[PDB]
Amino acid sequence: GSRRASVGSHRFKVYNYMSPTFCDHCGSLLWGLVKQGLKCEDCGMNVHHKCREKVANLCEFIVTD
Amino acid sequence: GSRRASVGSHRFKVYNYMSPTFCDHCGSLLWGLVKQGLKCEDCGMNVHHKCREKVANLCEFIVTD
Ligand SMILES: [Zn+2]
Ligand SMILES: [Zn+2]
Ligand SMILES: [Zn+2]
Ligand SMILES: [Zn+2]
């Protein structure tokens, strides 16, 4: 037996955060009131623009739907 | 880059084939006119009852939605 997972590479898009949000890579605040970072459209990971190139491309999540 | 795949184990359910259909494992006809075998609800693999025991559990398909 195994979980069903969606497995691919991240699909980051510039995101406008409405609440103070931290970088899931480095832990620092996503500064600004708009376009503060990128959110993966698939798994929800949030990263600074500068951290996009520091994260592994692997993007997985468990599918419950 | 990479494709995105849905990955898990097969989820077979007895299926009523409306046209002559073959076992995706062994190649022999799924005999009869109803409940001839099982179809994986995730990837569509068709198997005889007896072949359910023989196939690898791995179930993957490319997501195009
Ligand atoms: Zn992702
Ligand atoms: Zn960061
Ligand atoms: Zn399957
Ligand atoms: Zn068979």
Curated annotation (Swiss-Prot), chains A, B:
* Zinc finger (Phorbol-ester/DAG-type) boundaries: 10-59
The superkingdom of the source organism is: Eukaryota
Q: What is this protein called?
A: Protein kinase C delta type regulatory subunit
Coiled-coil region list: none
